[PDB]
Amino acid sequence: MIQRTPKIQVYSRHPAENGKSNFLNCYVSGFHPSDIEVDLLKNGERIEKVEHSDLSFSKDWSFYLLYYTEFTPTEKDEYACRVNHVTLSQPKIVKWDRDM
Amino acid sequence: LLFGYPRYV
Amino acid sequence: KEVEQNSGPLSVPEGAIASLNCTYSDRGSQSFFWYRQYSGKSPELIMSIYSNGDKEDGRFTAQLNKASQYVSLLIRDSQPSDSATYLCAVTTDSWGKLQFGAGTQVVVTPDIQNPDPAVYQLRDSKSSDKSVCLFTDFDSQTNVSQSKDSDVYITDKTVLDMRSMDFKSNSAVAWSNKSDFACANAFNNSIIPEDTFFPS
Amino acid sequence: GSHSMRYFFTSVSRPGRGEPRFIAVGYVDDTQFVRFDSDAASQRMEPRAPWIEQEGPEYWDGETRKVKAHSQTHRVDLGTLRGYYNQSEAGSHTVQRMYGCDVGSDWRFLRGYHQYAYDGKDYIALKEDLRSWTAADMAAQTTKHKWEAAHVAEQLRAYLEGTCVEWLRRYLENGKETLQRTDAPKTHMTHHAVSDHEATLRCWALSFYPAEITLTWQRDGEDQTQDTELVETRPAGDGTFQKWAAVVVPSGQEQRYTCHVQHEGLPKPLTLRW
Amino acid sequence: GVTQTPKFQVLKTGQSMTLQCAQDMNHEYMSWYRQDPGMGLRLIHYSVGAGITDQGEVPNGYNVSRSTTEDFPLRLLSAAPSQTSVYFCASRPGLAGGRPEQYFGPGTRLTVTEDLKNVFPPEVAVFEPSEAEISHTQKATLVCLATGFYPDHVELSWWVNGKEVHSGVSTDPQPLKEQPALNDSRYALSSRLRVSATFWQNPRNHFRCQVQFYGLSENDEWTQDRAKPVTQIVSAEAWGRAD
- Same domain for D48 and D164, yes or no, is yes
D63 by Cβ neighbours in 10 Å (0-12 / 13-18 / 19+) ranks as buried
Question: D164, D181, D198: which is the final residue of a domain?
Answer: D181
- What dihedral do alpha carbons C137, C139, C145, C147 form, nearest 10°? 10
The resolution in Å comes to: 2.8
CB contact under 8 A, A1 and D48: no
Structurally, chain D folds into a number of domains equal to 2
In terms of residue numbers, what domain contains D259?
Answer: 182-270
Q: How far apart are CA E242 and CA E205, in angstroms?
A: 11
Phi, psi of E239 (to 5 degrees): -100, 150
The HSE-up count of residue D7 (CA atoms within 13 Å, CB side) is 27
Cβ distance of D151 and E99 shorter than 8 Å:
yes
User: Are C17 and C76 a contacting pair, CB within 8 Å?
Assistant: yes
DSSP run (H or E) holding E17 = strand E17-23
Task: Kindly state the DSSP code that residue E82 receives in the 8-state scheme.
Answer: G
* Count of CB atoms situated within 10 Å of the CB of D55: 19
Contact residues on chain E for C155, CB-CB shorter than 8 A: 172, 176, 190
Contact between A70 and A13 under an 8 Å Cβ cutoff? The reply is no
| Count of the separate structural domains present in chain A | 1
Q: Which residue of A has its CA nearest to D242?
A: A13
Amino acid letter at D214? T
Q: What angle, 0 to 180 degrees and rounded to 10, lies between the N-to-C axes of helices D57-84 and D138-148?
A: 130
CA–CA separation, D105 vs D36, rounded Å? 30
Closest CA to E186 of E198, E194, E197, E178: E178
Best CATH choice for the domain E115-240 from the list 2.60.40.10, 3.30.110.40, 3.40.640.10, 1.20.1300.10: 2.60.40.10
In this structure, are residues A65 and A55 in contact, taking their beta carbons and an 8 Å threshold? yes
**Chain E residues whose beta carbon lies within 8 Å of the beta carbon of residue C94:** 29, 92-95, 100
Rounded Cα gap, residues D239 and C94, in angstroms: 34
Distance of CA E87 to the CA centre of its chain: 11
Give the β-pairing of D94-103 and D3-12: antiparallel
One domain, residues D228 and D150: no
Within this chain, do residues D134 and D227 fall inside the same structural domain, yes or no?
A: no
- In B, minimum Cα distance to C94 occurs at B5
Whether residues E97 and B5 touch (CB distance < 8 A) is answered with: no
For C97, name the nearest residue in chain D, comparing CA atoms only: D62
In terms of residues, how long is chain C? 200
How many other β-carbons are positioned within 10 Å of the β-carbon of residue E181?
8
Cβ partners under 8 Å of residue C144, min gap 6: C135, C154, C156, C157, C172, C187, C190
D159 — contact with chain B (CB < 8 Å)? Answer: yes
Whether the Cβ atoms of residue C73 and residue C104 lie closer than 8 Å to each other: no
One domain, residues D158 and D246: no
SS3 state at D100: strand
The Cα–Cα gap between E197 and E168 comes to: 13
Query: If DSSP codes are grouped into helix, strand and coil, which group holds residue C78?
Result: coil
Asked whether A57 and A64 are in contact (CB, 8 A), the reply is: yes
CB D246 within 8 A of CB D257: no
Rounded (10°) CA dihedral C179, C181, C184, C185: 130
Task: Determine contact, residues C23/C71, Cβ cutoff 8 Å.
Answer: yes
Q: Do D234 and A27 touch (CB under 8 A)?
A: yes
Nearest to D231 by CA among A11, E234, C45: A11
Q: Are D236 and A22 in contact (CB under 8 A)?
A: no
Q: What letter represents residue E36's amino acid?
A: D
Query: In this structure, what are the phi and psi dihedrals at residue C164, rounded to the nearest 5 degrees?
Result: -55, -10
Contact E152, E160 (CB under 8 A): no
Chain B partners within 8 Å of C31 (Cβ): 4
Residues 1-9 of B with CB under 8 A from E: 4-8
| Cβ contact, residue pair C93, B1, below 8 Å | no
Give every CB contact of residue E232 below 8 A, 6+ residues apart in sequence.
E121, E212, E213, E215
For residue E228, how far is the Cα from the chain centroid?
20
Nearest-10 Cα torsion for D153, D158, D164, D169:
150
Nearest CA-CA partner of D167 in D13, D1, D28:
D28
Looking at residue D12, the DSSP 8-state letter turns out to be E
Give E-chain residues touching B8 at CB under 8 angstroms.
95-97
C-alpha to C-alpha distance for E19 and E17, rounded to whole angstroms: 7
Is there a single domain that holds both residue D162 and residue D198? no
Q: Answer yes or no: do D22 and D143 share one domain.
A: yes
What 3-state DSSP class applies to E200?
helix
Are the C-beta atoms of residues D203 and D246 closer than 8 Å to each other? yes
Nearest to D116 by CA among D149, D89, D153, D86: D153
d(CA E114, CA C36) in angstroms, rounded, equals: 34
Provide CB contacts within 8 A for C117, sequence distance 6+. C137, C138, C139, C142, C192, C193, C195, C196, C197
Query: What does R_g of chain C's alpha carbons equal in angstroms?
Result: 22
- Residue C183: phi and psi, rounded to 5, are -90, -45
The verdict on a CB contact (< 8 Å) between D155 and E100 is yes
| Residues D235, A27: C-beta atoms closer than 8 Å | yes
The Cα A10–Cα D232 span in angstroms is 12
Cα separation, A34 vs D4, in Å, equals: 25
Using the beta-carbon criterion (under 8 Å), do E97 and D149 form an inter-chain contact? yes
Task: Kindly list the structural domains of chain C, giving each domain's residue range(s) and its CATH number in brackets, ordered by start.
Answer: 1-110 (2.60.40.10), 111-200 (2.60.40.10)
| Residue E45: half-sphere exposure toward Cβ, Cα within 13 Å | 20
Angle between helical axes of D163-174 and D152-161 (0-180°, round to 10): 30
Please provide residue D232's backbone torsions phi and psi, each rounded to the nearest 5 degrees: -50, 140
Phi, psi of D169 (to 5 degrees): -55, -45
Strand bridging mode E187-196 / E169-171: antiparallel
d(CA C100, CA C43): 11
For residue A44, what is the domain's CATH number?
2.60.40.10
Domain hosting residue A57, numbered range: 1-100
CA distance A55 to A36: 11
Task: Identify residues of C whose CB sits under 8 angstroms from chain B CBs.
Answer: 28, 30-31, 91-94, 96
Q: Which amino acid is located at D202 in the chain?
A: R
Query: What residue segments make up the domains of chain E, in order of their start?
Result: 1-114, 115-240
Distance CA D215, CA D230 (A): 8
End-to-end Cα distance, chain A: 34
Q: Which residues of B touch C94 (CB under 8 A)?
A: 4-6
Work out the minimum CA distance from C11 to partner chain E, whole angstroms: 17
Contact criterion met (CB below 8 Å) for C140 and E174: no
Residue A71 contacts residue A24 (beta carbons within 8 Å): yes
Compute the distance between CA of residue D11 and CA of residue D140 in angstroms, rounded to an integer: 17
Pairwise CB contact (< 8 Å): D66 & C93: yes
Are E12 and E79 in contact by the 8 Å Cβ rule? The answer is yes
Say whether both D209 and D117 belong to one domain: no
CATH of E1-114, one of 2.60.40.10, 3.30.470.10, 3.65.10.10, 3.40.50.1380: 2.60.40.10
Last residue of a domain, one of D154, D181, D208: D181
Are D165 and D108 in contact by the 8 Å Cβ rule? The answer is: yes
**DSSP per-residue string spanning D144-168:** HHHHHTTTHHHHHHHHHHTHHHHHH
Q: D169: helix, coil or strand? A: helix
Please state, in angstroms and rounded to a whole number, the distance separating the CA atoms of residues E11 and E6. 13
Q: C195, C139 in Cβ contact below 8 A? A: no
Q: Choose one of D125, D148, D181: the last residue of a domain.
A: D181
Which among E76, E86, E88, E83 is positioned nearest to E30, based on CA atoms? Answer: E88
Burial of E174 (0-12, 13-18, 19+ CB in 10 A): exposed
Whether C8 and C20 have beta carbons less than 8 Å apart is answered as no
